[PDB]
Design a protein around this ligand. Structure first.
Ligand code: HPJ
Ligand code: HPJ
Ligand code: ZN
Ligand code: ZN
Lengths: 176, 176
């Protein structure tokens, strides 16, 4: 039903040299309550808060989370922004002020109509031990590692309900 | 209002040692037409198609795009999957078979009600030269670099309408 491998490659062009230093820097998700999101991403997932930016006229804050050593965060405020925003693979959480206190408000995770965004995914050394720890911490699951046909791969959800895939790259090929 | 820097830090925890090797591997977006999406991400953005996986019973294809040298892609199939799925900062595009032929179908970019996911962002050496080339290539813009308040920061759109931030970490706007 889909493209063949050769048809897909027929649509691919070699990377133009003007793009050689481009990097996929961030994925932005809006979060209802930053206190709950910061606790989940740092305590449960082990990410580090590398930069916090506040925009008082726009009435929002940005929280940059990444798998980085906090000791690599520069001291100078200008060098800190240039370093945080040049890290690959960051998660940018947007807090629109006041959502945490609004009962009628909630964000949409993209996995039910209207669909679009699906998930972020974390590569781990051991899906089963990571998931046993998530169960112990009361994390909500979308798919446990041994549920469904795709055994050894899981999906959990964050406080806003966004999906997070948990995968071990060294054990994926046997699923084909 | 927003959180203070100290209040945000109090919500954070140091990383449990069992998460020390976790990495943010992928961001998944559903795409209506893989031919259009592959052309955009490779020719316009300069990403490389590092892995394509087809699931005949799930009725979908997965395309993994990343800023990687095509010469680093392994030759053998199982080695290829383990390498592609262990790269940081990949973009996973999901093609649910048949959407390209459904005139009434379209994905939602998360930027209009109901909101959630907002965008991916690419860090570039210079926003102006990057955007000059995007203009020459007929890319659709949400925000040109000098439109509105924040200068030197742009937002473009992919073929499904997902927003893509174009930023230069060395030339970000001054924070209040
Ligand atoms: C509970 O509903 C969850 C969504 C449906 N669903 C179930 C399993 C599954 C795996 C992949 C999947 C497979 C793979 C994969 C598997 C084997 C080899 C190579 C890639 C990579 C990947 O990123 N993803 O997301 C994608 N959707 C999946
Ligand atoms: C087209 O409407 C888009 C939504 C509203 N909007 C306008 C400008 C703008 C910049 C950032 C922004 C600023 C920054 C930033 C700016 C200065 C210092 C540090 C971070 C990082 C970042 O990832 N983003 O997304 C986020 N939303 C922004
Ligand atoms: Zn952003
Ligand atoms: Zn995935």
């Amino acid at each position: 039903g889909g493209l063949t491998d050769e048809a897909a490659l027929s649509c691919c062009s070699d990377a133009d040299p003007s793009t050689k230093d481009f990097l996929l820097q961030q994925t932005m998700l809006r979060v209802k309550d930053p206190k709950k999101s910061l606790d989940f991403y740092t305590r449960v997932l082990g990410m580090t808060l590398i930069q916090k930016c506040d925009f008082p006229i726009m009435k929002f804050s940005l929280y940059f989370l990444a798998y980085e050593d906090k000791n690599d965060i520069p001291k100078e405020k200008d060098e800190k922004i240039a370093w945080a925003l040049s890290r690959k693979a960051t998660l940018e959480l947007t807090h629109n002020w006041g959502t945490e206190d609004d009962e009628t408000q909630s964000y949409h995770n993209g996995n039910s109509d209207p669909r679009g965004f699906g998930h972020i995914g974390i590569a781990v050394p051991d899906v089963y031990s990571a998931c046993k720890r998530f169960e112990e911490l009361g994390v909500k699951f979308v798919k446990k590692p041994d549920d469904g046909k795709m055994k050894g791969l899981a999906f959990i959800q964050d406080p806003d309900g966004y999906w997070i895939e948990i995968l071990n790259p060294n054990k994926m090929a046997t699923l084909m």
